[PDB]
Each structure stands twice: as C-alpha cells, then as structure tokens.
Amino acid sequence: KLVHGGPCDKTSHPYQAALYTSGHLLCGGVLIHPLWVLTAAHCKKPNLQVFLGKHNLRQQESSQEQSSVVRAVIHPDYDAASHDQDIMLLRLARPAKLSELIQPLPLERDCSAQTTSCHILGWGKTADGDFPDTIQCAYIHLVSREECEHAYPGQITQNMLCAGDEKYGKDSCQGDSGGPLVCGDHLRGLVSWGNIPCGSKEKPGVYTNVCRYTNWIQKTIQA
C-alpha cells in the first residue's frame, strides 16, 4: 500500500498549528512563514499560545515546545456578523525551526487556480471517549460560487469560498475551525463557518478565500 495513499494517511502534517488559550485547544491554524501562523479572525482570544509539529494534544497540554504569540493582527475589515474577511495573522515569539516535523504551507496566489480536489485538517477526538485531540483529515471538493450562493442566500461574499462532498466529508470528519483547506498542495482556505469542517454538496462548508489576502499578508509580514 506504499504511496497508494494520500494526505489523510500521513502521520504528520508539518504546517498544522494548534492554538491554545487558558489551557484549552481553541482552534487550528497554518504555519505560512517561520514567524507567522494564519488562522480565522473568529479565533481571536487573549494570550494565545501556539503548538507546532504536534500530533496529539491534551487540555492543559504539558508537552511544552510551545510558542507564545506576541502580536495578533486581525484583518481590519473583519465583520463578525457575516464572518466576511475571517482571517488573522499571529506573530510567534521566536522563528519556527523548520524540520521534518515543521514546515510552512505556500499560499495559493491565483484565485483562478483550477485544482478542486482538496483536503481539510482540524483538531478533534477520533471517537467518543476522552482520548487526546489529534489531527482529523478529510477529503472534499470545491463547489462553484453560484452553487455556494444558492446554499447560503445573501451570505456569501467574494472573500469566501465553499467546499464539501456528497459523502458528507470523509468518514472521519471531526475537527475544529481555523485550520486549512489545502488544494494542489497550497493553502486555499481557512475553515470559517457553515456546515464545517466537512459540508455536503448542498450544505457546504464555508472557508475564507485566502487567495484574496496575499497582498495584505505580505504587507503585514514585511512591515
């Protein structure tokens, strides 16, 4: 079965970050630069802590190797009621030391990119119990903007995209928000609202349209 696999068989996802506040895992995120993690604006909380290169995490996580966030930059036009422009940059206390276990994910710079086969990542417990949180992965497909707008009338802006699968995710769709939607091995979206983290075709998940933000991200990082 060697290679016969895909992202969801991977034991490690080097670009997946976990965001904690007061000892509890609140959201996922994505390492996009050694000094910055990208997540949803709806994930903003005080004194955020980030864990990189992790596979399994617990509440009051003791396994150190964490990095405190020293600056949080929410998109200035974020609107909580609509979740329009649901994106936020987190500056780490130290640059991440890249390794086999920690690597940034490149951003999709082309809003017209053609790849529609994707996967999402989120932190969750594989099954009812009390085991640690682990990375839940599922395969899904992008849904056309017109189809997206029909499922959520009057609520979809150009800063959002939809994705889902008739199967209702990928028989393993536990997971939180703020984490990545990855298409063609680039960051295409962040889990934002709707039927998440895996939507169906007629009630899809809604994701921040990351390709819209490449200039703002660059301006902020280079500032």
Q: How far apart are CA 43 and CA 183, in angstroms?
A: 22
- Give all strands (DSSP E) within the chain, no chain letters: 16-21, 24-33, 36-39, 49-52, 56-57, 66-74, 88-92, 117-124, 133-143, 160-164, 180-183, 186-194, 205-209
Q: Which listed residue (13, 83, 86, 133) is catalytic?
A: 86
Q: Which residue of the set 42, 75, 83, 186 is catalytic?
A: 42
Q: In the chain, what are the domains?
A: 2-13+105-211 (2.40.10.10), 14-104+212-223 (2.40.10.10)
Residue 149, phi then psi, degrees to nearest 5: -65, -30
Of 133, 177, 186, 192, the active-site residue reads 177
Terminal-to-terminal C-alpha distance of the chain: 47
Backbone angles phi, psi at 211, to 5 degrees: -60, -25
Nearest of 129, 116, 128, 124 to residue 204 by alpha carbon: 116
Structure resolution in Å?
1.8
113 within 8 A of 188, measured Cβ to Cβ: yes
Q: 52: which 2 tokens?
A: 């990189």
* 68 catalytically annotated: no
Q: For residue 103, give Cα distances in angstroms to 15, 30, 97.
A: 5, 10, 9
Q: Is 42 a known active-site residue?
A: yes
Task: Look up residue 86 and give its two tokens.
Answer: 């649901």
For this structure, is 165 an active site residue? no
Helix, strand or coil for residue 151? helix
